From a paper:
We analyzed extracts from temporal cortex of eight cases of [name]/[name] from the Kii peninsula. Cases 4 and 5 also contained tau-paired helical filaments (PHFs), like those from AD and other conditions. We used the standard tau filament extraction method for all eight cases, and the optimised procedure also for cases 6 to 8. Besides tau filaments with the [name] fold, we also observed tau PHFs in three cases from the Kii peninsula and tau filaments with the CBD fold in one case.
pmcAmyotrophic lateral sclerosis/parkinsonism-dementia complex ([name]/[name] or lytico-bodig) is a fatal disease found in the Chamorro population of Guam (1–4), some families on the Kii peninsula of Japan, and the Auyu and Jakai people of New Guinea. Abundant filamentous amyloid inclusions that are made of all six brain tau isoforms are characteristic of [name]/[name]. We now show that tau filaments from Guam and Kii [name]/[name] adopt the [name] fold in brain and spinal cord. The greater heterogeneity of amyloid filaments, when compared to [name] and SSPE, probably reflects the fact that [name]/[name] is a multiple proteinopathy based on neuropathology, as suggested for cases from the Kii peninsula.
Numbering used by the authors:
A (entry chain F), B (entry chain E), C (entry chain A), D (entry chain B), E (entry chain D), F (entry chain C), ...: 304 to 380
The structure:
Amino acid sequence: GSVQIVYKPVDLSKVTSKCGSLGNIHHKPGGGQVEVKSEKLDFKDRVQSKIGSLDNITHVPGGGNKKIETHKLTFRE
Amino acid sequence: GSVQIVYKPVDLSKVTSKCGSLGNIHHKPGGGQVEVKSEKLDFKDRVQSKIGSLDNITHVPGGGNKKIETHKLTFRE
Amino acid sequence: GSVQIVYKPVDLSKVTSKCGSLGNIHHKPGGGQVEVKSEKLDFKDRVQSKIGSLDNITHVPGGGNKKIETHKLTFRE
Amino acid sequence: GSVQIVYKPVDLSKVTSKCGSLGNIHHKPGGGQVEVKSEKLDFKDRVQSKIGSLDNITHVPGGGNKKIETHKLTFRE
Amino acid sequence: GSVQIVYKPVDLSKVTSKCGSLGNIHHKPGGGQVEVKSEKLDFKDRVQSKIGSLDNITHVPGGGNKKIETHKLTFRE
Amino acid sequence: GSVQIVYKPVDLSKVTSKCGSLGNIHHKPGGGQVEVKSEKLDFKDRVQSKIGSLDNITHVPGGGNKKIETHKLTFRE
Amino acid sequence: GSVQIVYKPVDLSKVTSKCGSLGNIHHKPGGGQVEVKSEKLDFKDRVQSKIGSLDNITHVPGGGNKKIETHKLTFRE
């Protein structure tokens, strides 16, 4: 009683982006006020806590393109 | 009772980005005020805590492109 | 009862970025005020804590492109 | 009952970035004020704590490109 | 035809201020951004021009009290 | 036709200020950004021009009190 | 036709300030950024021009008190 498994994922994908020009991009924030009053914090296992923040990203890629691919062959006899 | 497994992922992907020019990108923040009053913090295991922050990224790649790929063959007899 | 396993990941990927020019990129922050009052901190195991910060990245790569790939064949008889 | 395992990852990847010119990149921060009042800190095991910081990176690579690859064959009889 | 003029201003004024204590006075500004683009300026005769300014007075007198008094006898025959 | 003029300003004024204590006075500015682009400036006669300034006075007198008094007898026959 | 003029300003003024103590006065500025681009400047006659300045006075007198007094008898026959 043979088990024969044949995983053959072929992937000829493409992800592609032509641009002429990005040009004028002003990002001109006027100041903030933030206040946070915590007493106790217990974080445990897997955490990300951005607590009490005032911030400004200006993320201008020259085409940001992204491809994700997850293959998984679990087997249990 | 033979177990024959054949994992053959072929991947001819591409991720691609032409640009002419990025040009003018002003990022001109006006100042902040942040206040954070914590008493106790216990972090444990796996943490990232950006607590009480005032900050300014200007991330301008010449095309940022990204490809992720995770293969996994677990087997349990 | 033979176990025959054959992991053959072929990967002909590419990640690619042409640019003409990046040019003018002003990042001109006006000053901050940050205040943080913690009493106790116990970090343990795996931590990253940026506490009480005021900061300014200007990360301008000439195309930042990135490829991740994780293969894993666990086997338990 | 023979166990035959054959891990043959072939990887013909490429990560690539042409640029003409990066050119004008001003990073002109105006000063900060930061205050941090901690009493006790106990860090343990694996930590990174940037506490109470005011800072300015200007990271301008000539194309920063990065490839990660982790292979792992655990086996337990 | 005699002209007899008799100016007799008597002034027994007082201006007065008792205080116990002034005590805690925090003046904690978070930073600014100002931009001014003038081409031509011609000022003439009597001017005060504070142009393009970012500033912070903290004027804490121990009682500031002020008395003005202007007398004037013009005469034209 | 005699002209008899008698200017007799008597002035018994007082300006006065008792204080116990001035005590805590924090003046803690977070940094600025100022930009001024003028082409031509012609000032003439009587001018004061504070152009393009970023500044911080902390003027704490021990009672600042001030008295002004201007007398003037013009006469034209 | 005699002109008889008698200017008799009597002035028994006082300006006065008792204080116990001035005590804690922190003046803790965080740095600035100033930019000024002028082409031509012609000042003439009576000028004061503080152009392009970043500065910090901490003027703490032990009571600053001030009295001004201007007398003037012009006469034209």
